[PDB]
A paper describes a structure:
Bacterial ribosomes frequently stall at the 3′ end of mRNAs lacking an in-frame stop codon due to physical or nucleolytic damage to the mRNA or premature termination of transcription. These “non-stop” ribosomes must be rescued to maintain protein synthesis capacity and cell viability. All bacterial species that have been studied use trans-translation as the primary ribosome rescue pathway. We previously reported the discovery of a family of acylaminooxadiazoles that selectively inhibit trans-translation, the main ribosome rescue pathway in bacteria.
Numbering used by the authors:
A (entry chain B): 2 to 272
B (entry chain T): 1 to 94
C (entry chain d): 1 to 46
Amino acid sequence: AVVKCKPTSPGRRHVVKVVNPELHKGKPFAPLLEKNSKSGGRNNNGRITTRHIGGGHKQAYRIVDFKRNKDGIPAVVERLEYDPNRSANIALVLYKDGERRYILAPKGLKAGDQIQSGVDAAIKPGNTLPMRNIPVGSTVHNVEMKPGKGGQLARSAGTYVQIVARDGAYVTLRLRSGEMRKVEADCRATLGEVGNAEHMLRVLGKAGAARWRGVRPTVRGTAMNPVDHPHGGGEGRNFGKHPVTPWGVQTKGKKTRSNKRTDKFIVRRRS
Amino acid sequence: MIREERLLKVLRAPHVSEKASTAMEKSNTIVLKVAKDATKAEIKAAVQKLFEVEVEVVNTLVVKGKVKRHGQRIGRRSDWKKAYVTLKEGQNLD
Amino acid sequence: MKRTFQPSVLKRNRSHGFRARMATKNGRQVLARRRAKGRARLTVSK
RNA sequence: AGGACCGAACCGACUAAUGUUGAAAAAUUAGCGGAUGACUUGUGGCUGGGGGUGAAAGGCCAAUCAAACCGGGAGAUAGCU
RNA sequence: GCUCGCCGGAAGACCAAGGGUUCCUGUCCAACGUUAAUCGGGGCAGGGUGAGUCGACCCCUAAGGCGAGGCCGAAAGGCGUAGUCGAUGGGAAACAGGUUAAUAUUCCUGUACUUGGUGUUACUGCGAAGGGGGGACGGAGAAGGCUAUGUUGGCCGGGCGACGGUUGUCCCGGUUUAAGCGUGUAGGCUGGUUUUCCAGGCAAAUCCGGAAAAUCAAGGCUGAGGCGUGAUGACGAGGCACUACGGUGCUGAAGCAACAAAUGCCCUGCUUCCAGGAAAAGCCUCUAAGCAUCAGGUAACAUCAAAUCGUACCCCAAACCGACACAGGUGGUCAGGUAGAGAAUACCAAGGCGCUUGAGAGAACUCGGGUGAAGGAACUAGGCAAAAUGGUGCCGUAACUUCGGGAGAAGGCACGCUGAUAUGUAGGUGAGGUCCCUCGCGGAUGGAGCUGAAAUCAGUCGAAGAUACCAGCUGGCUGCAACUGUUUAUUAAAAACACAGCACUGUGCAAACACGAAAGUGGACGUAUACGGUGUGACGCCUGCCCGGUGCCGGAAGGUUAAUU
């Protein structure tokens, strides 16, 4: 659940922790760790591409099975773990032949619960199977877009996707954006919602928590000199111009999706 | 086993100093200006051939040459290799 | 006051040293110009 | 417990005086802020000039910055001195 | 040489970087040194740096670089796979004493250790580019056990006082000893052992992982420190003989206990938190190919090897970076006594210095200070600067409030020394003795001894007891910004920027956007509870009307309309 904390300093005052008691107090599964190192927002040319990234706490990478494959072997959930990589929680889970794997944690779920992947498997939250075998009207999550590729839709921490219609080789998804999308129906999905659903119910409290999450501060554009932004400069607070990106194209309203390849799949846009 | 040309190449000189004479009279070591590429086994085998003496062990060091000025014109002496060679006991050397 | 030259010979040989010049095309064209001028010290390197 | 308090190292530079051909091409002295953090620091790397980088002052990028430095066009041009 | 003064968490000692002979000795004073100069980091000559164990090198990898092929690019070239480099991180091993003018964990003495061959003999499944384990990791907090170390007593040696007293509860000095080896302790972690099976670990695997079944809770791992040995040794106050007055040679007592005690060790621990905390190798183990009674594997022993390079000296500076023998900058390590909470500060030890012009005189005036009648901000743009407050314990403490604060609010009281309580108390530590004991580095009791606050009462001194150094000025109203932060290196630290929070908007993933002629990369190994851009800036109450204008979004009936034909 949430807590507010008592305001026994400034900048403790407005904080909300999301705490979860049953997340596993101790070190994660050291096969399925690996290293990931930080970009600082900088590509292989070393220029900053995506600004306002840097710093923050050192993070390892949990390798998480989205692709999700061990079909008709039952597994049982060992434990739930924090993941610093991603907004949801993960589950360390244990198959009958003694592979352990990391999954996303679905919403109901706890230690000792039984999961099964693939086509037979019983339609409980956690289970994964093709969505020609999902019955229509289910909430599912961690959703393949191409078959075999792995779960790309609804991963973060309180979301899920609606299955609206199935016409032959395709199903139709109501996404979390409120898009409607045709996806080929031999894609996999996992039942139920993704777990840590009060994740938005945090608030951060101070600048330091944003810095530990590795977010360098954002200078807004009208502060600058007009060499630096389009918005820049002017005596006192002036801004007699239409609001743009720093490379000078419109940001309130103007649509940017250009991809004519995928446009047969988009049934309806968001609104 | 090291070639006779190389063994005759290695030793340049005995070195004369107070520290040379005191180490000779006390701890039974000679000191040699040797070749600057000469290794410890080369020095040991060379002196064991070439003064027919028994040696314990050899320590080397590199001397770095000083920087001088012959009048105005600046100038550097050569580096060279300096070998502390202790003999086995009751070996004399001339 | 921390002045600008703050030496270390690893950084010096990595930045202006001989193989650093010799790796790239214009860095050779440094060494072409310094030979053709006739410099006694070619690179920075001891 | 804490971007908590007081306060050394450390980091910084708010006030005054001196200094202004200085001990110093920005410091000393007396006080001053932070001092477990958005801290500070060593070593190495990466980002190159209409470019970088910037908790944004047009700041900084080798005592140089409303476009670094070096060489070249180049003896630019100069109705001006 | 005798005094004096200064530093002493440094102005001492040691490393890394950086420098490059500045180190030591002889010799010289032309130049250099802000003066003289016999002196020197100056000139000239000679000497001086010794390693299996220190470091580099080497093995391993991070960021990152290069990059066979490959992809892309007018050319140049860009990116990148296999790889191969790249420490600032991981990986084997030496300490004590002595020695030179200058080196020493390198040389000498004593005592060890590590890794590789080789060769024996004993034994018999060896083998990897692969599997598994391990290496292997955060912040904060908390004690407990210790140690470095210090203090006191004991012991040993010396002393009996320049001037009153000082054979004593007197003064001074010393009271040191490592690595290794053996023991395995406080502690911490973990249930072990056997048997069977198995969709997993790219193939295999006796190894791991997972399922069973049986048996015993006592077995394994780790581990400071102590103890014994090292050590009948070395060292050792001092003495005794010579003297190149520099020092040399010889001899050499005591060498214990108690208490205190780290920020060092156990501790890569434990507890807690969220912001969830490198890799690879050495190492352990498994088997694959292969071999085959060989090779190899491990065991003791014997023997050989451990190359090369650096090693002087400066290192918070006269030797490095600042043009200077420059009030500057410069990372890490050691951390004594008294008082003190303290690495503050004061005086000191060890140690090191007196800052490379002196000598007078004692005008104005300048600078740094001390004090001041009476007044107390009248000065002034402005209490600028000065002055003033300052510690600990206890009492007490307002408006307002987001209930946390405000608040150390304000303000006041006690403070030294001596005695008694109490020949030193509460407390801490804890020997003998005794008992138990599966027997020890054991468990009880027992308190010797040592250390030791805090308070009360009484007395006493001074003008003054937080006496020096050190060490908040306080209150009221109000503008602005919520706050901690950030900023114009070198005239601006703010109301400027940032910020948590909010709102709009874009973006369905080969996303949007950005750097890129492109490949490619960031975003992100993330997936609308996510990311980017814009504006606003905690929180409370809110956020009214206008779409005419300019943008933006949607529509496509008509008008206008390019290349093309």
